A paper describes a structure:
Each Plasmodium falciparum genome contains ∼60 PfEMP1-encoding var genes, which can be classified according to their chromosomal context into groups A–E. They have large ectodomains containing multiple duffy binding-like (DBL) and cysteine-rich inter-domain region (CIDR) domains that can interact with specific human endothelial receptors. In particular, subclasses of DBLβ domains found in group A, B, and C PfEMP1 bind ICAM-1 (Bengtsson et al., 2013, Howell et al., 2008, Janes et al., 2011); CIDRα1 domains from group A PfEMP1 bind endothelial protein C receptor (EPCR) (Lau et al., 2015, Turner et al., 2013); and group B and C PfEMP1 contain CIDRα2–6 domains, which bind CD36 (Hsieh et al., 2016, Robinson et al., 2003). Here, we used structural biology to determine how a group of PfEMP1 proteins interacts with intercellular adhesion molecule 1 (ICAM-1), allowing us to predict binders from a specific sequence motif alone.
Of these, a complex of the PF11_0521 (PlasmoDB: PF3D7_1150400) DBLβ3_D4 domain and ICAM-1D1D2 formed crystals that diffracted to 2.8 Å resolution. The PF11_0521 DBLβ3_D4 domain adopts the classical DBL domain fold, consisting of a core of α helices, decorated by numerous loops. In contrast to previously characterized DBL domains, an extended α helix and a glycine and proline-rich linker form a unique feature that protrudes from the domain and generates part of the ICAM-1 interaction site. Site 1 is formed from a patch of hydrophobic residues along one side of the extended α helix of DBLβ that interacts with a corresponding hydrophobic patch on the surface of ICAM-1 D1. The parts of this loop not in contact with ICAM-1 are not observed in the electron density, indicating flexibility. This loop is indeed predicted to be intrinsically disordered, but becomes partially ordered when bound to ICAM-1. By testing the eight residues that directly interact with ICAM-1, we found that each of the three subsites contains a critical residue that, when mutated, disrupts ICAM-1 binding.
Author numbering:
A (entry chain B): 1 to 186
B (entry chain A): 727 to 1026, 1038 to 1125, 1157 to 1187, 1194 to 1214
The structure:
């Protein structure tokens, strides 16, 4: 009885969406949308169709289109999937001067970033990938062990996040931490 | 100032300014792909099965005729069987619409577009005949431009011959600019009148012809184009040949039409839906004027019977057009909202709007139109959070871009001045100066 367009939405958080609640009836008694999101109804000639502009979408919501029809009351749902880059990408404070032969642990904490299924964390030495793992847990912690060598004197270590939203036709959102320049001795 | 826009102090950006932004983006794309030399045809280097001498396209372009073609002989000339009754430029001609006209909803077909001189293009591939496909290697592109230039010349000359009042030099040019742009959309594969059988066949042939054009492109160039209907290739072919097409449309004109950008129009950069909406308002204002002129008999119950029938004829006819305008307004309102939401979300790459494939350039054009008129771009602040307009309505758009000079007394395309309707409302039951007159 009750239909909704779009049925599934991918949008940035704090963003807006245009939702259309529609019913199979010609003259229904009730027609609206149940959602705690700020809404502005776009005035149209249709009495069985209603357009809504949902703003400030901060988290995953399921706005429910409702309609009381003579055949019976019916509901329809749209699945809003919100996305946002990590709030904090940082390598754990490590002293620059490290001796040759040391087993050096590089720890990167990643605070937030969603959808997590599309967010992966990368540890690099320059542009060379050391460890690439999907971001799991809050905060997502990625670790690698580097054996300090003379060759690494001056080398920059960094932590990068990749929110790849290309499968659903969007951009790959990259984020880099503050670099750590290794300085060797001995 | 705009009588359908809420009080604003924003720096205005016109549709032509957006069309120039799209003009710049079109030549940047063609030059970056390096396909111009390969896509720009020379019709004098083509082959023409109808008998016309190829060289004529170089020596005497304005002298070309039905013989300078590869269309089947049953297609006598590009204008053959087009507008026999001569209704195209008649003031009250109704605009057809619905599922029988377009896939895209709330599309109203201009009679000028309905009776278009593209018969040669329709009969390039028909019942065994496919002369354009049987030409010597390296001449398909050159021969194709020939038929495109012929269709363009004949379309412009048909306009000069049958336009309502030959003295209206600006009116002829307005229609020639609309025709040029419409030719472009046909060639690009973005034409909205896609439900007509003849138009379906024309598009099927365009794909077959572009299958061969693409096949004859160099290895490095061929790879830059992907798509079954060759939409990106046809977009770049148009950009590479549109200057020649425009010059062919000035043939036989004692009063040649000016080109507002690089001696060519900008109209072919405005999406078809918006262009057709503009033309609709202009041809409604001609009908509104015709209907208002019928109320001249109402110079004064009694002998005002001739006025009573004139006031009601005005009412029944105006409401027929208002119903079309409402569908146009409410569609534009939806498309502009979609464009504004895209901008709020951070534009493309940040948000993919749910819209008909046909309305994607319309939502894209209105998106840039929103941004350049003071609209706020970029994703919301919560997207990349760190740890510690007068064109908003179809009425507003019309008062900015459309020729409304023909509308008498009832001129305002919006019911209310900014947001019972105003006495200057275009689609009012009767003209405001005839209120006491219609009530005799
Ligand atoms: O050529 P690869 O198959 O990539 O071999 C690598 C390469 O070192 P080699 O060229 O000496 O074989 C790496 O070093 P880079 O080329 O990236 O500088 C790496 O070293 P990292 O610790 O810098 O990642 C490591 O060499 P090593 O054992 O010195 O660490 C490893 O070579 P191995 O096969 O000898 O392990
Ligand atoms: C997050 O990653 C998953 C897995 O790659 C994406 O899911 C795919 O999406 C496409 C298009 O919607 C489907 O055709 C595939 O079948 C999906 N694969 C799987 C294994 O589910 C998902 O779209 C990504 N999210 C975003 C926002 O791009
Ligand atoms: C992530 O990247 C975006 C875009 O480059 C930027 O605006 C944002 O501040 C970055 N956030 C962090 C935590 O680096
Ligand atoms: C590391 O980064 C610094 C700038 O922060 C740069 O001067 C230096 O050359 C980089 N090291 C290497 C090995 O490129």
């Amino acid at each position: 009885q009750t239909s909704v367009s779009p049925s599934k939405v991918i949008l940035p958080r704090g963003g807006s969406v245009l939702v259309t609640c529609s019913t199979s009836c010609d003259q229904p008694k009730l027609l609206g949308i149940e959602t705690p999101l700020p809404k502005k109804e776009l005035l149209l000639p249709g009495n069985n169709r209603k357009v809504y502009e949902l703003s400030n979408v901060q988290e995953d919501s399921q706005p429910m289109c409702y309609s009381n029809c003579p055949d019976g009351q019916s509901t329809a749902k749209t699945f809003l999937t919100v996305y946002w880059t990590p709030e904090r990408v940082e390598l754990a404070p490590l002293p620059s001067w490290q001796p040759v032969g040391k087993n050096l642990t590089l720890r990167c904490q990643v605070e937030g970033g969603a959808p997590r299924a599309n967010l992966t964390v990368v540890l690099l030495r320059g542009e060379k990938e050391l460890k690439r793992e999907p971001a799991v847990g809050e905060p997502a912690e990625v670790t690698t062990t580097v054996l300090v060598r003379r060759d690494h004197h001056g080398a920059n270590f960094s932590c990068r996040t990749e929110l790849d939203l290309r499968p659903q036709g969007l951009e790959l959102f990259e984020n880099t931490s503050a670099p750590y320049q290794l300085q060797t001795f001995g | 100032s705009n009588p359908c826009a809420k009080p604003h102090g924003k720096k205005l950006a016109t549709v032509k300014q957006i069309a120039q932004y799209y003009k710049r983006k079109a030549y940047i794309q063609l030059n970056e792909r390096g396909s111009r030399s390969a896509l720009k045809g020379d019709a004098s280097q083509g082959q023409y099965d109808r008998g016309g001498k190829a060289d004529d396209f170089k020596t005497k372009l304005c002298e070309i005729n039905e013989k300078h073609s590869n269309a089947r002989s049953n297609s006598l000339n590009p204008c053959n069987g087009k507008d026999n009754n001569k209704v195209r430029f008649n003031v009250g001609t109704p605009w057809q619409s619905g599922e029988k006209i377009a896939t895209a909803t709330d599309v109203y077909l201009p009679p000028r577009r309905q009776h278009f001189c593209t018969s040669n293009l329709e009969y390039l591939i028909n019942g065994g005949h496919q002369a354009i496909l049987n030409v010597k290697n390296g001449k398909i592109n050159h021969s194709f431009l020939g038929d495109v230039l012929l269709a363009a010349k004949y379309q412009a000359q048909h306009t000069m011959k049958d336009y309502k009042s030959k003295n209206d030099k600006e009116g002829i040019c307005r229609a020639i600019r609309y025709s040029f742009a419409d030719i472009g959309d046909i060639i690009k594969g973005t034409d909205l009148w896609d439900k007509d059988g003849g138009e379906i066949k024309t598009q099927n042939h365009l794909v077959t012809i572009f299958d061969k054009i693409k096949a004859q492109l160099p290895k490095d160039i061929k790879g830059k184009y992907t798509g079954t209907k060759h939409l990106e290739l046809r977009k770049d072919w148009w950009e590479a040949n549109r200057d020649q097409v425009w010059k062919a449309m000035q043939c036989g004109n004692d009063n040649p039409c000016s080109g507002e950008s690089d001696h060519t129009p900008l109209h072919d950069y405005i999406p078809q839906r918006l262009r057709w909406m503009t033309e609709w308002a202009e041809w409604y204002c001609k009908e509104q004027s015709r209907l208002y002129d019928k109320l001249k008999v109402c110079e004064e119950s009694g002998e005002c019977a001739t006025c009573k029938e004139a006031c009601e004829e005005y009412n029944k006819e105006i409401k027929k057009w208002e119903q079309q305008w409402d569908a146009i307004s409410y569609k534009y309102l939806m498309l502009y909202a979609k464009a504004r939401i895209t901008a709020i979300n951070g534009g493309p790459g940040y948000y993919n709007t749910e819209v008909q494939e046909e309305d994607k350039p319309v939502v894209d054009f209105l998106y840039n139109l929103y941004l350049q008129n003071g609209g706020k771009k970029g994703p919301p602040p919560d997207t990349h959070r760190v740890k510690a307009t007068p064109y908003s309505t179809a009425a507003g758009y019309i008062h900015q871009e459309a020729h409304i000079g023909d509308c008498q007394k009832q001129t305002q395309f919006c019911k209310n001045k900014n947001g019972e309707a105003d006495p200057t409302y275009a689609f009012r039951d009767k003209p405001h100066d005839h209120d006491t007159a219609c009530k005799c």
